[PDB]
Design a protein around this ligand. Structure first.
Ligand SMILES: [Mg+2]
Ligand SMILES: [Mg+2]
Ligand SMILES: [Mn+2]
Ligand SMILES: [Mn+2]
Ligand SMILES: [Mn+2]
Ligand SMILES: [Mn+2]
Lengths: 86, 287, 683, 287, 683
């Protein structure tokens, strides 16, 4: 189970989600991998996943996208989103 | 963001009835037909009766329930204009054009008139329904107030503006134009106070308030069409008056931050004729 | 709601979390089938159509007479042999609303896209059937887009001029000011935008024939020109747009800038006059060193030296002006003036920042004149000479006023066809024809410069669209490499076609021998530096195309030295904001403002997704506001080194950035060699 | 017999603080001691509070309960003057003379000052106790209003008048004199309405109403003494101001049709020095 | 306060119930002794003064070179031999503040009254010593007053033009409108006021090259003219003043009047452009019968008939236009338009009312052209031909544009000296010299008409002053009898001098043979009616002067028939404003507005009683607003019948008189033969 964060350095909401993902890694990092990808440097992956703003959070399970969340989310909402797929 | 600006615009528009001499209107009044004189009298009485409700209830009730010293002051100023300036101005126009007995009869007729009463009582009903510390009921009353200021008056204003645009009854037309200019700013101001309440609501509550506003507009509009035919068919103007009502309904909606309801139409041209610095700190010239 | 608009409205209705971009093709199909075919008048044969259009004052009979009817018929057939289909609803809507010929009552459509293209091609060829078919193939493939005046008015009788822009030099006299107003109104009647150089006008409070402190400065002339453009506003089809350009060392620079302030009173405020500021490198040097600067009174300089202030080198003559007691001046703070410029651009988008020394350091025609100002779109940087209009019954000394014939290459379509050379050469020929057939009797200097300079503008567009549709980020170094290579090839083939035209006609542009083309200084960086792509991904784009090498540039330099150059100026990148829709291309070389443009035409909103926008290339179509403006400056400077004229460089800024960020972008553009800056758009 | 003449007088007295340029007081203000400036700011702040409540609450509520469109027009106009003109003028004075922090501090000081809160509590309480169709509750509120107009303002008015009379702060003083001129006619008018209600009563009821009026006056008076000492001891004027408020208490009683209650005293003489389109016809074309 | 100003303020300090009018002479003495004699540059001799003034570019050298220094010294001695003394302080103040030559720093005074008069006389004589002395006697006696431009700028290098007016015909083309703007600015920089006829310009919603609803009307041209006059503000010392005239049958007449409304928005309102309305008799007839009128689109009439709307007699062609389906028009109410005119004049004093048929009923040069418009002062009524200004490098068709060569007779000083003949002839010679020496290169039509028509304007002033100082009420029939006799004498001697100049030069004005002077139709009322005074009191005023009789007029008619007439126009009564103070005269033939003028100068309040005002003639100096406007119309019409051009007739209205009263005054003026109505001054 992987939480992929599509972000950019200029994106205000993406700066707000960064500390939330660090807390989530401390609490769940034994069962959840967190991956960050910068869409300004990695346009091909952002295009492949048809991701249409930032932050976009993809929950992947064994390489397949099982859930998609757009915009800022608090920690508890990200935990609920990931715990469905653990 | 807006009350001090409206304060300024309101007080700089201050005027008094005595400033316009009315007697010279008798030189065009005498040349109108009976139907024209009848329609004018009835329209004038309609405006007078509605404006009295606004002076005695509409503005003072809103001033009472709105919080903020500066808003209460602006609202007080508007209430003053209704009672001290507008009401005296309408009376002056009447006393100039008709003898005492004719004035009393016209007011008796318009007081019993079904279409005038329907709209007058609908508006007054919403003012009477405001409850202390309930912003929803206040908003509904503000909508009613904006509809009166920016919409309901205009089936009436049409006729004086129509004459004014033709060079007839110029003194009373000048007075009406000053009154109308006050009601326009009153409508815009109360509209901003209503939007403030609207913007504090949830999305479901907003949709519900929009439905209220549109439903109310529809009821008033259908009665305006009947009111219009009742007064203006005898002088052949109803088609053009209806266009003017819809155009002003759209302005009232825009005052409440809502989209126009009616398609854009052209208006009678005679009535139209009547109407972050950040200083360069060096090291920015080097890259 | 119309069916086509409702189908176009389905773009943003997301199913499965995806935009319905396939609905735009359905939208264009519905648009055609339900409106265009029904409202297009059809003739039994092309002969009837041409006869009806010529007889009803729709077409000129002169340009159609050089071809036999079989030639015109075959040109139309080869226009319809392509079977061109518009890719988006907005393309067809824009074409059939702005450019397609309609009847006198504007109720029926007389011209298809393939008929407009055929007529424009027949106008371009001027009696050559094969050349007309070549132009038809060029335009129906949408490799080259003639400017809006040219595309709209070629071969038409109810036409203005084919020139998109005019640049007037206003001399310091009442006769010259009145004639400038007259010419501005005449050229606005023709439909073209007019830019005026007010730097020669003497400052406010100057002397008029021993009568001191009598002038109103350039601001009175701005008011006159503003009312002239309002009066000659093309009857209301489109408001008369004019431009006023002033040097930053003019005394009236603050008064010139205050015209765009919102707080400015109506007695000093202009409304239809776009303002541009010409910034020499001396001003940037003074602002960098924080020394107090001086703006000068032009008439004092003229009296002392005999030349206008903008006619002399500011970097050399600034200290002489400051040390001259006879040259009146007032002290200003150059850094405060730069901050005022930044705040004005933030609040209104004005002025157009023109870096004079960035233009004249690589200007090929500095012997004719330095480039003292730009056009209304801040992309036409040409040498101009002021005209001394004398009294009545006195012969006027007619100078050179810039006339710019514009044309745009669709980079996507040019690159997909692997036809840089043929497209550039055919576009150069078409622009030469437009310049030749254009005469303007009421502007002696514009006409003289059109006949002598023969300057044309060959722009480019769909740069960002091509890059995003090829998986290249506009800010990426690969994008800059592609721009470098593509525009080097464009410059190579434009120069080659100009030299070939000069050889065929035996004549070069006036004063060519003193230009860097004749001396070979223009080709130094081309015979010294190789501009082939440095990235294998970019080099693969130019596969099947001969990239001009150093040896090829040496051969071209020798060819130009032997035969000359027909055009003084060839390349200039205009914004092309209107014809971009028809060609399904991004406007200019600028990055896209919005991925899906929201437009309201009537009571219905019409969404326009960017050309080729899809799910796989969503993040390659990065909006210009989210992009680093330094990277955009780098891109434009990479393009600008291969463009002899300017580029309409628009700055796309966020509301979070301050006036210091705007000044930093301006100074980075100046440092990177950017010639002009068009607009400061805030989101 | 009187409303029309009060209507005419009120509307002819209309003014705005912006008519008076205040920058001329800058130097005489700068020259006052810290004690004097403090008392002056606080005095005007106390006045601002009174006018705020008279405009927001007192005048509108009395207008609501008084019958007759002309009487209502006068009362509405007076209400507007209170909050749209009078209360605002004090801010014009503050914004000219004082820095923002001193202005912020004085408005915080009104909120926590016990005498100013007590007098507001008492006056506004009576306004809000008015019951529809209950003339006695209305009379009580009108007595309170007369006491505010003709008595309570005067502990505040003393100081601007005291300076005006010495040729100091004369622009601010001009504003204050205009305010005072208004309050004098407001106190008379409301007094006449109160007398109307009083005159309807039995002798027994009248005796109770006099008791109410005198008890209320004494209660307000005792509070005003403490307020006066609190403000004026630091400038040495408390005894002088006390004589002035007693003088004006008698004027308030007289406005209510009652005999003076305090004995006459000599007031500071400085403070006393501080006080057409005619259309053509067919016969104009032949001569 | 100054001593002279303080003494002037004692005029209103009443002692024994009478104004201290004798204090004014003390005011002049104090003013001179304490200010003028101290601050006038005095030279050891006239030679040094002349050398200083010519060398320092204060005087022109060409006009002084025509005389030896002995002749100039004798002329100056003749000026100073009179020992002229200003009788009121305001006269000296006006001269030494406006018309006296001052040093370049304005600290000192270079010219006395006897010096300016001597220089003007030397300019007028053109090398003749006896003629110069005659002019000196004429001006130092204050019999004749050259206009403000002529008096100010005669013989001075730092000047403008001696011409007061410029009446420009604007043709219906963008080139013609641009040339109108250019010529308006080039004549405003010369100082003279410019009036433009806009009746030929096509209305709003007309076609520009077969595209409909394209024009924005004459209001856009008025905007351009207003901003042109604002730009040419003559340093701002005197704001650029310009007039625009429109026929009342022009379609834009309502929008033309709407620009002077106070309620008019800034998007339509013009400020520096005065407006005048030309009313043919047809409009008055339509208003009289209360029948619906029609305002026509000028370009439709031009297309249908090949002639402009204002070149065709509307009294004859109105019906033809109305029943013509190819002529576009909209129904209007002529009485409503008259009421709109009356209320516009009540509110702002605009427009000037020009009764075209009243002008053309007695216009001598109708063959050249009918009088379509008047000047800025609404008193010049001359034939004008439009100029077809074509595109550049195309020859323009130059027409006729009117110019003011103005000069005023002081009726009081003219009749005290019993020299009507000598004064009129010398004034005619001076105006002829001014017209001949005027050569304006930037206005082709103005220069051509000045050379061809040779028209001059000889007005009169101090009519009310003379009448009141002779015990005659302005409204009294004796005053009208005196005006009849005096202005018949003036016309007789002006015609005689024009014929004498034609005989002595051998040339008449261009197209003289078609004028009523050649046919003898002009002299019909002069050879059929005797204009000798009908009152014994009035006849005694002319004692010692030969009043021309019917036989004398017959001899003059024969002399004109044999020898011709040099001037197309000779007499026009200007408002005679600020220069009336210097001559100690009432302004024009108008009645005095106030008995004692209350004027503010700096921090002082200055009082100017009208000349000759005292206790005995206090009620003879009746204020203009107190007069019956009908009797003033009678007076002007009595004067108007002897003036070939118009009279600047200002209406003086009370506040109580409504728009119906103003319309009655206008219609009585039209009925009595009044040609123009200048202003509606409401008290
Ligand atoms: Mg010059
Ligand atoms: Mg033409
Ligand atoms: Mn009202
Ligand atoms: Mn209202
Ligand atoms: Mn108050
Ligand atoms: Mn009060």
């Amino acid at each position: 189970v992987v939480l992929a964060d599509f972000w950019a350095p200029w994106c205000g909401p993406c700066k707000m989600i960064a500390p939330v993902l660090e807390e989530l890694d401390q609490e769940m990092g034994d069962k959840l991998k967190i991956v960050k990808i910068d869409v300004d440097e990695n346009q091909e992956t952002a295009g492949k996943y048809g991701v249409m703003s930032i932050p976009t959070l993809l929950v992947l399970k064994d390489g397949e996208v099982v859930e998609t969340s757009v915009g800022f989310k608090p920690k508890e909402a990200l935990q609920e989103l990931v715990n469905k797929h653990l | 963001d807006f009350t001090q600006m409206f304060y300024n615009q309101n007080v700089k528009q201050f005027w008094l009835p005595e400033e316009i001499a009315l007697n010279g209107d008798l030189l065009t009044w005498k040349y109108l037909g009976k139907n024209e004189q009848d329609t004018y009298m009835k329209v004038l009485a309609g405006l007078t009766l509605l404006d009295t409700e606004q002076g005695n209830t509409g503005m003072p009730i809103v001033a009472e329930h709105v919080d903020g010293h500066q808003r209460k002051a602006v609202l007080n100023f508007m209430a003053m204009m209704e009672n001290a300036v507008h009401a005296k101005s309408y009376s002056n126009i009447f006393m100039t054009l008709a003898p005492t007995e004719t004035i009393n009869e016209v007011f008796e007729w318009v007081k019993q008139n079904k279409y005038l009463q329907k709209k007058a009582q609908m508006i007054v009903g919403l003012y009477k329904a405001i409850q202390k510390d309930d912003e929803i009921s206040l908003f509904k009353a503000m909508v009613a107030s904006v509809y009166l200021e920016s919409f309901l008056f205009y089936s009436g204003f049409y006729y004086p503006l129509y004459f004014y645009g033709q060079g007839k009854l110029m003194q009373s037309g000048e007075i009406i134009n000053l009154i109308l200019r006050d009601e326009a700013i009153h409508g815009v101001y109360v509209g901003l106070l209503a939007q403030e309440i609207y913007n504090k609501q949830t999305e479901e509550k907003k949709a519900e308030l929009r439905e209220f506003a549109i439903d109310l507009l529809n009821q008033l509009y259908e009665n305006e069409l009947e009111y219009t035919e009742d007064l203006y068919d005898q002088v052949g103007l109803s088609h053009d008056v209806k266009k003017f009502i819809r155009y002003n309904a759209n302005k009232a909606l825009m005052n409440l931050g809502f989209d126009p309801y009616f398609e854009e139409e052209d208006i009678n041209p005679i009535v139209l004729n009547g109407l972050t610095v950040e200083p360069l700190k060096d090291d920015d010239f080097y890259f | 709601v119309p069916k086509w608009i409702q189908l176009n409205n389905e773009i943003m209705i997301q199913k499965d979390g995806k935009f319905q971009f396939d609905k735009d093709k359905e939208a264009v199909h519905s648009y055609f089938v339900d409106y265009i075919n029904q409202n297009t008048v059809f003739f039994h044969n092309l002969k009837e159509k041409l006869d009806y259009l010529v007889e009803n004052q729709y077409y000129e009979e002169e340009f159609l007479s050089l071809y036999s009817f079989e030639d015109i018929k075959e040109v139309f057939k080869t226009a319809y042999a392509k079977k061109f289909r518009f890719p988006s609803f907005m393309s067809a809507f824009k074409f059939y609303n702005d450019y397609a010929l309609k009847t006198n009552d504007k109720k029926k459509i007389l011209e298809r896209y393939e008929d407009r293209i055929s007529i424009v091609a027949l106008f371009f060829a001027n009696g050559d059937t094969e050349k007309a078919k070549e132009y038809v193939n060029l335009m129906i493939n949408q490799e080259y887009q003639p400017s809006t005046p040219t595309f709209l008015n070629a071969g038409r009788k109810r036409r203005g001029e084919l020139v998109s822009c005019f640049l007037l030099e206003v001399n310091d006299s009442l006769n010259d000011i009145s004639r400038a107003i007259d010419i501005s109104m005449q050229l606005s009647k023709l439909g073209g935008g007019v830019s005026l150089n007010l730097s020669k006008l003497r400052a406010k409070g100057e002397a008029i024939k021993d009568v001191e402190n009598a002038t109103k400065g350039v601001v009175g002339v701005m008011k006159l020109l503003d009312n002239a453009f309002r009066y000659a506003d093309q009857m209301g089809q489109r408001q008369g747009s004019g431009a006023a350009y002033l040097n930053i060392f003019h005394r009236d620079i603050n008064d010139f800038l205050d015209t765009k302030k919102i707080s400015a009173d109506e007695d000093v405020r202009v409304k239809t006059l776009s303002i541009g500021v010409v910034i020499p490198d001396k001003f940037v040097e003074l602002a960098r060193e924080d020394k107090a600067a001086y703006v000068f009174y032009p008439h004092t300089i003229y009296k002392e030296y005999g030349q206008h202030m903008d006619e002399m080198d500011m970097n050399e003559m600034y200290d002489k002006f400051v040390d001259n007691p006879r040259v009146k001046k007032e002290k200003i703070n150059p850094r405060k003036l730069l901050e005022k410029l930044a705040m004005l651009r933030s609040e209104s988008g004005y002025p157009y920042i023109m870096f004079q020394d960035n233009v004249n350091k690589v200007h090929a025609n500095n012997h004719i004149s330095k480039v003292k100002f730009s056009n209304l779109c801040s992309e036409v940087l040409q040498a101009s000479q002021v005209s001394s209009y004398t009294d009545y019954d006195e012969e006027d000394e007619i100078g050179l006023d810039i006339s710019c014939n514009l044309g745009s290459l669709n980079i996507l379509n040019v690159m997909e066809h692997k036809s840089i050379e043929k497209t550039v050469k055919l576009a150069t020929d078409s622009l030469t024809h437009v310049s030749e057939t254009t005469d303007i009797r009421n502007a002696p200097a514009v006409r003289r410069a059109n006949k002598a300079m023969k300057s044309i503008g060959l722009g480019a567009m769909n740069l960002h669209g091509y890059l995003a549709q090829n998986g290249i980020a506009y800010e990426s170094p690969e994008a800059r490499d592609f721009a470098n290579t593509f525009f080097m090839m464009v410059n190579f083939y434009s120069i080659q076609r100009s030299a070939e035209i000069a050889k065929e006609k035996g004549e070069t542009f006036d004063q060519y021998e003193g230009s860097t083309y004749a001396t070979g200084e223009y080709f130094d960086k081309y015979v010294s530096t190789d501009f082939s792509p440095k990235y294998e991904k970019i080099a693969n784009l130019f596969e099947g195309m001969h990239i001009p090498t150093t040896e090829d540039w040496k051969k071209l330099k020798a060819f130009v030295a032997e035969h000359g150059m027909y055009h003084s100026y060839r390349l200039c990148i205009a914004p092309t904001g209107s014809i971009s829709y028809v060609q399904s291309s991004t406007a200019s070389v600028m990055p896209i403002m919005e991925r899906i443009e929201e437009r309201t035409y009537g009571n219905s909103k019409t969404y326009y997704p960017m050309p080729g926008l899809a799910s796989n290339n969503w993040f390659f179509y990065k909006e210009a506001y989210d992009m680093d403006m330094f990277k955009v400056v780098d891109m434009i400077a990479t393009i600008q080194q291969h463009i002899d004229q300017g580029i309409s460089f628009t700055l796309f800024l966020k509301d979070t950035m301050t006036t210091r960020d705007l000044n930093r972008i301006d100074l980075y553009a100046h440092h990177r060699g950017i010639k002009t800056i068009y607009y400061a758009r805030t989101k």
